[PDB]
């Protein structure tokens, strides 16, 4: 036997998924996103006021880039268009202490506010490398947005669009 489950499901995103995308990045090029999350069809995903990130962003030589580096998560509507009203997690790079912050409640770093993503909406991870630094690679890097395995950390909440009578309201 199996136990029934709700439509809401708790997950944790990362690099090696299909619907997410990525690309390499060079120094001094903030407008080039290294990660492009993209809403699947017939799905909505939700993020409450605070959810962790694991912003691993290393060099080709597997070294975290300069602490002067900065990360900006950013919502985007359709049209592949950035948006300012609606933005999460403006931070540096040189502040995470990767090896612990993936684990510890205090080193953990959450969002600024909540978020919702319709069937087709983009989110981008812009990376301000100052200049003259080492280039970015993605295969030597990871990323997350939730801690669903643990018991103190939050996680991403996915729903299928069909399973709602408030779907029209959340579409508005």
């Amino acid at each position: 036997n199996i136990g029934n489950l709700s439509a809401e499901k708790q997950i944790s995103l990362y690099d090696g998924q299909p619907f997410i995308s990525e690309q390499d990045v060079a120094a001094g090029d903030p407008n080039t996103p290294a990660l492009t999350i993209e809403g699947p069809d017939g799905y909505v995903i939700a993020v409450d006021a605070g959810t962790p990130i694991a912003p691993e962003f290393r060099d080709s030589n597997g070294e975290k880039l300069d602490p002067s580096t900065r990360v900006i998560v950013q919502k985007c509507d359709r049209q592949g268009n950035p948006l300012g009203d609606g933005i999460i997690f403006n931070d540096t790079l040189g502040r995470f202490n990767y090896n612990k912050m993936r684990t510890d409640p205090d080193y953990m770093r959450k969002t600024a506010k909540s978020l919702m993503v319709d069937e087709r909406e983009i989110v981008k991870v812009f990376v301000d490398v100052p200049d003259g630094a080492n280039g970015y690679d993605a295969e030597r890097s990871r990323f997350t947005l939730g801690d669903d395995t643990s018991d103190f950390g939050k996680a991403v909440e996915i729903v299928d669009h069909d399973d709602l009578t408030e779907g029209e309201t959340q579409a508005v």
Binding site: N1, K9, T103, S150, D151
Partner: protein, 229 residues
Amino acid sequence: QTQEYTLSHTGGLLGSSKVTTASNQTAPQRETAIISFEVPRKFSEIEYVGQRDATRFVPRTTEEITGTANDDTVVQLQANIQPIAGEEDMADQDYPVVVAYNVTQGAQVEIADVNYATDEVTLATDPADGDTVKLWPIMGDGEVQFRLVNQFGQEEGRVYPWATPLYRWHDFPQLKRGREINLHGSVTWQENETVEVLLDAPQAITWEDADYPEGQYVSTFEQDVEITL
């Protein structure tokens, strides 16, 4: 009459007959099965509850590396390596990420240094020409899921449709309250309604080799349950 208990990759509550171990498919990646859990003779039922119940899984692979007169000391691996809980300092990893053993000299092979994300390693010692060595790095870059069987092979389906990765598995430090694992899922299975774990990955897996030094069992899976007697 509900009491919590623990399972293993070996025997225990099953006598090594109501459980099996198995390798995986590599050349075509397939979400194959490596381990099952058949209900034995006695029990009325078993229960698993992610978000309440724990899990542990320590996977390692195997290879074979010769040696040379002008031996290299250096190796590369087609299996991505990461730490477990923190740094790659083999002294304080909470269990090593690599094990090595020379075959000619029936002895360990200690490590000097690791090329971390390069997925290469430097050793401490100097192997000899035609000398065989067996390694057991950990396994990453692979999924995992659970499922169920209706006494034949007709699957009910799956516990929780979404997978989980193994590099992540290593990353979360086991052995720490709160930082423990608690997946999602809630199930029940009675006599002969066996469970089977599934894994999809390129690389192999290893349960035993009979030459692995540390305790006869290269890998393990261990788990908590809530049993009705």
